[PDB]
Amino acid sequence: EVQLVESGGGVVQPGRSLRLSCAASGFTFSNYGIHWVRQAPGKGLEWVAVISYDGSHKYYADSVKGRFTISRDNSKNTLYLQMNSLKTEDTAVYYCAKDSSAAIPYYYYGMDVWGQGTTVTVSSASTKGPSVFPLAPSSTSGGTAALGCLVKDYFPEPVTVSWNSGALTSGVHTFPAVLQSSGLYSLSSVVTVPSSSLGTQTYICNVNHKPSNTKVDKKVEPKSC
Amino acid sequence: AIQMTQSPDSLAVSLGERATINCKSSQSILYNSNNKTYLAWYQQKPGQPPKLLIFWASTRESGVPDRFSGSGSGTDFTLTISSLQAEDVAVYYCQQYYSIPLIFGPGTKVDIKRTVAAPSVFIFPPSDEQLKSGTASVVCLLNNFYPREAKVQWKVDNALQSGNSQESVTEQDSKDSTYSLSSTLTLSKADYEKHKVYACEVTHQGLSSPVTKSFNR
Amino acid sequence: HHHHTNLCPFGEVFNATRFASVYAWNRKRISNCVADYSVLYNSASFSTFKCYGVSPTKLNDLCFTNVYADSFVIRGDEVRQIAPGQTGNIADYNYKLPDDFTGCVIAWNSNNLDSKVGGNYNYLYRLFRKSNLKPFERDISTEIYQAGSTPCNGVKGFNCYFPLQSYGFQPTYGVGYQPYRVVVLSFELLHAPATVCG
Ligand SMILES: *[C@@H]1O[C@H](CO[C@@H]2O[C@@H](C)[C@@H](O)[C@@H](O)[C@@H]2O)[C@@H](O[C@@H]2O[C@H](CO)[C@@H](O)[C@H](O)[C@H]2NC(C)=O)[C@H](O)[C@H]1NC(C)=O
Ligand SMILES: *[C@@H]1O[C@H](CO[C@@H]2O[C@@H](C)[C@@H](O)[C@@H](O)[C@@H]2O)[C@@H](O)[C@H](O)[C@H]1NC(C)=O
């Protein structure tokens, strides 16, 4: 029944500032130190900062030293992280990790409670909806052909791709997005069907992109020559 | 800074079999004045935050199953899962907290070891709608294969292409325990019409020889 | 109205109004009475009941020279430390049981008693200490703990911390952090031939 809730993440231009906050409940917040640990997309965990159970000791990572500022407010049960001069290498998910006992050099007992984590994107880019292009199933395999939608060029994350408005679910693979050199993302979502029903079923993907109020439906059909 | 190293980087092991993950630190994490090694083990599943399994190198955290055990002292450490369950498929990190900065390992990916499975290979020419924009996207799909390791090779007019393709891989499927891969070859409309044959060569353990699917523009 | 053939006042210890803090745990010597442990082991109101060195059924037909009852309050996640050969904030710095502990451990959730709305700061625990506690050692000292290079001189400062911390029990906490009352029965069986007692 104890939980840490991150907050304040979003999109920020390179070099600009942004302040994250993490709210704790269910335990005496003023008895334990808290950490910040970030995680780049598809990369390992990286430790960021820590603050003792009173604010006396604050230490930072060599990659964020002098750019970040950790602080807490034991009266409001909240901890903060002040990020300045952000880089695209700072784009990651930021978790607050409760320690097991204070945070004086030799009293780090490891971090037992973690938050869901808020996301921070640092890129010189604007809000753009996606272009949904079909992936036609031409002349396949041994009775199982595939089709899909190409959700290309959008910012920022994320997108939700449903098939037939939630009906078609089995054999569906929505792939994680990739960041292009243009600063925009690209994502493909496929589905494998038996080759015998390729016409007997009109296939439609529903692309939803809340950042730009974009809901696009695209009908996929076998290509005609 | 105390550098943490884990071996192996990926350990696919069948269920009920034992999984062994190792962790070596550059400096000794054993504190002299209390005989306590400041080493921890974390488990991170997709979409979830990490979870503390072991601290003090050998003490199991409240609520962790008994199949999780840690061992080692000083510089060499080991997290052992005696009988791997289907729910234990995650990424495992070791972390030192002796001195600052606190530093994690590179992580070890653990998946269940099913029998080998070759991928279904598909190729998708760019949509007529996309060519109306000036950019072409040739997609190459690898469907339900195992293990995760593979190699995608783009060849436009037999000329092997590189630096012009990005890939995506799905997590291990919850039912048949297979991965899938999406490769996107992006070219300009000009460079696309300059050629005819577009293929992607898939080399994988389940394929006795490299398989190639192609199309002519 | 008291005799030696009377019954031991186990109510005074278990059903007590207030309980001691763990760092200053309260010990009572149960003496000059008939100890009938059937009142305890036939009661489904305890959440932890583990004996070490004795079968709980053998308690009523054994021969003890001294019986002690230790009471205190801790967190849920700390009750696992009230056992021989454990480590943590409670076993190392507050209440340490010996490896050859010959007794019983009885715990139960008291969130409806030892937690107040804004946080019950009457229950404390020792957070810092130089060396570990000996078994059944008691450290009620509130001397400033020196975590740095320079002395502290009895003054809270940088690298100079007060050693006791409060739990701050509120009812909204998780069970791992709710107040649990603990009674620890310690025994000293008399040396005798089996022909005498057992
Ligand atoms: C601890 O107390 C409970 C109940 O205590 C209440 O307050 C006491 C001061 C006394 O006045 C009791 O009558 C109150 O009910 C004891 O449990 C009771 O035991 C009797 C048998 O002796 C039984 O008839 C009742 O139903 C029980 N009530 C409950 C709520 O369990 C318990 O025995 C006491 N334990 C110790 C170790 O003293
Ligand atoms: C030192 O500790 C030994 C066991 O310690 C435990 O296991 C090792 C691997 C570390 O992880 C440590 O943190 C654990 O607590 C004891 O067997 C040994 O007797 C101890 N010796 C002294 C002198 O304290």
Numbering used by the authors:
A (entry chain H): 1 to 139, 142 to 227
B (entry chain L): 1 to 217
C (entry chain E): 329 to 526
Q: What text comes from the article?
A:
Alpha-B.1.1.7, Beta-B.1.351, Gamma-P.1, and Delta-B.1.617.2 variants of SARS-CoV-2 express multiple mutations in the spike protein (S). The RBD mutations found in Alpha (N501Y), Beta (K417N, E484K, and N501Y), Gamma (K417T, E484K, and N501Y), and Delta (L452R and T478K) are located in or closely adjacent to the ACE2-interacting surface where they have the potential to modulate ACE2 interaction or disrupt the binding of neutralizing mAbs. To understand this, we generated 674 mAbs from Beta-infected individuals and performed a detailed structure-function analysis of the 27 most potent mAbs: one binding the spike N-terminal domain (NTD), the rest the receptor-binding domain (RBD). A detailed structure-function analysis comprising 22 X-ray and cryo-EM structures is presented for 16 Fabs most in complexes with RBD or S, which allows an understanding of the changes in antigenicity of the Beta S protein.
The 417 focus is reinforced by the BLI mapping, which places the antibody almost exactly atop this residue, and the crystal structure of the complex confirms this. However, the binding is quite extensive, almost entirely restricted to the HC, with H1-3 contributing a total of 597 Å2 interface area (in contrast the LC contributes only 110 Å2). The serological data shows good correlation with this, H2 fails to reach Lys-484 hence this mutation has little impact on binding, whereas the N501Y mutation has a positive impact on binding but K417N/T is also required for effective neutralization. Although Asn-417 does not make direct contacts with H3 the extra size of the lysine and the concentration of positive electrostatic charge presumably combine to have a significant effect on antibody affinity. Beta-22 is glycosylated at residue Asn-35 within L1 and the sugar, as observed before, lies in the vicinity of the left shoulder (Dejnirattisai et al., 2021a). In summary, specificity for Asn-417 seems to be achieved indirectly, with the residue nestled at the heart of the antibody-binding site between L2 and H3. Although there are no specific high-affinity interactions, placing the residue central to the paratope renders it sensitive to the change in electrostatic charge at 417 characteristic of the Alpha, Beta, and Gamma variants, but agnostic to the residue being an asparagine or threonine.
